[PDB]
Design a protein around this ligand. Structure first.
Ligand SMILES: O=C(COC(F)F)N1CCCC2(CC2)C1
Length: 460
């Protein structure tokens, strides 16, 4: 029974509006409705992993697991295994997997983050799950961010708190937040970004939606505009939105957007918006292809419509050689030439690097770099040919070319990371000096760049 080199992953996000779901929700898991939808010919083909995020979920974990599992069994005739379930207040994540994957999945982690302070602490935040699927790390975040059209900055803040404080994945990757810990990270939820147009334009917006003309609405979507200004979700991807706004509907129909201010809304307008989103970030040069992104049309218990997204995702096998794991393979080496970090910091400490990778027995600390002044004010930290030669556990190019090196640049004074990034070993050539590059972030914000050359030796 061969190990897969690809899997498909279903991501669902649904703000249930505190109401029980209808008796049939299969259209959600089939990626049927509006947007980029899944071909009918695939309806019986199970996804490998289903990850369901809910917000304003009124059900018990048991109640929702029974609905989800029975839904999938009706669609696929497969009884899925529960990988993880985690709930914070009314924010929930469920991970289900085909039974054949039960012993491919390990290192299952769950966590939550509560966002805000005092007033603003008590119902928003995020839940998440991570695990290993054979040689591949997967992370999933379901967040319910702050509501309200005039709170996009709060949402951005909620994002940064969640990525800083959600404790998923390998705790040994201490300098790295969840935006660097996973081969594939999926972040979804009721992110609550709105279409920023004047209230007086409500009926115009509705008109545009009825015409399926989304371009002048998407150009005012706060998530797209904040992402373009690098205010949030730096280095994440989102598929093009080709489905109608998923909020705010009158319940029991989809024929009406309920946008007008009400006591129940805190006297706020809810212009039609794409509140409900799926984004991802995968390590460089790993296969990830969105194969659906849309909303259901036939699930109407909530003032939101469910959103679906599906992905092909590259995965690797749990590699064993006669040498590593449990030793190095002297036929493998990773060398860095002419490397330098460019940092936005105004500080003047010395810096050193840490290289972290599951292709190493443990992380590697460099010598301090040499600080120079860049011609436009910047700190340039030069490592020259000084960086330590990295000794991978396995030299086989079928393993090593699929690996990645996480890099942290740390202050010698404080041992605090000033920037984190990732370099793929999926090179054009081995035994050949080749350019490398990663942006450096810290708390998910851009802090610099790391660039130089790499020389990878494999057993071939
Ligand atoms: O064994 C597994 C998962 O295994 C495989 F399906 F990922 N779990 C035991 C503890 C409780 C749990 C939520 C159901 C996960």
């Amino acid at each position: 029974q061969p190990e897969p080199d690809m899997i498909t992953i279903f991501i669902g996000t649904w703000n249930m509006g505190n109401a029980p779901p209808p008796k049939k929700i299969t259209s959600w898991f089939l990626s049927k409705g509006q947007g980029k939808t899944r071909d009918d010919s695939a309806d019986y083909i199970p996804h490998d992993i289903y990850v369901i995020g809910t917000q304003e979920d009124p059900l018990s974990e048991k109640e929702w697991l029974e609905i989800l599992k029975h839904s999938l069994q009706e669609i696929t005739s497969v009884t899925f295994k529960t990988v993880a379930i985690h709930t914070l207040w009314n924010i929930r994540i469920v991970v289900l997997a085909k039974p054949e994957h039960e012993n491919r999945i390990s290192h299952i982690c769950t966590d939550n983050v509560k966002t805000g302070i005092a007033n603003t602490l008590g119902n928003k935040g995020a839940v998440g799950v991570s695990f290993m699927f054979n040689g591949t790390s997967l992370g999933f975040v379901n967040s319910h961010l702050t509501s309200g059209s005039e709170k996009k900055l709060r949402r951005n803040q909620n994002y940064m708190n969640i990525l800083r404080f959600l404790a998923l994945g390998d705790k040994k990757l201490s300098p790295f937040n969840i935006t660097h810990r996973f081969t594939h990270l999926f972040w979804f939820g009721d992110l609550n970004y709105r279409v920023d147009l004047p209230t007086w334009e409500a009926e115009t917006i509705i008109q545009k939606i009825k015409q399926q003309q989304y371009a002048d609405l998407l150009s005012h979507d706060q998530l797209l505009t904040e992402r373009r200004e690098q205010k949030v979700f730096l280095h994440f991807e989102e598929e093009e939105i080709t489905f109608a706004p998923t909020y705010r509907f009158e319940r029991l129909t989809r024929d009406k957007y309920a946008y007008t201010k009400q006591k129940a809304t805190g006297m706020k307008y809810n212009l039609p918006s794409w509140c409900d989103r799926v984004l991802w970030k995968s390590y460089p040069l790993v296969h990830v292809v969105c194969q659906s992104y849309g909303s259901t049309s036939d699930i109407m218990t909530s003032d939101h419509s469910p959103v679906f997204a599906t992905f092909e995702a590259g995965v690797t096998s749990q590699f064993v050689s006669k040498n590593g794991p449990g030793t190095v393979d002297s036929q493998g080496q990773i060398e860095f030439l002419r490397c330098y970090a460019t940092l936005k910091t105004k500080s003047q400490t010395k810096f050193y690097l840490e290289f972290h990778s599951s292709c190493l027995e443990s992380f590697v600390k460099s010598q301090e770099g040499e600080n120079e002044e860049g011609s436009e004010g910047e700190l340039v930290v030069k490592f020259g040919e000084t960086l330590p030669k990295l000794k991978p556990i396995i030299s086989d190019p079928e393993y090593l070319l699929d690996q990645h090196i996480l890099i942290s640049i740390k202050s010698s004074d404080s041992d605090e990371s000033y920037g984190e990034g990732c370099i793929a070993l999926r090179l054009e050539a081995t035994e050949t000096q080749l350019p490398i590059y990663t942006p450096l972030t810290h708390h998910g914000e851009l802090t610099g760049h790391f660039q130089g050359e790499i020389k990878l030796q494999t057993s071939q």
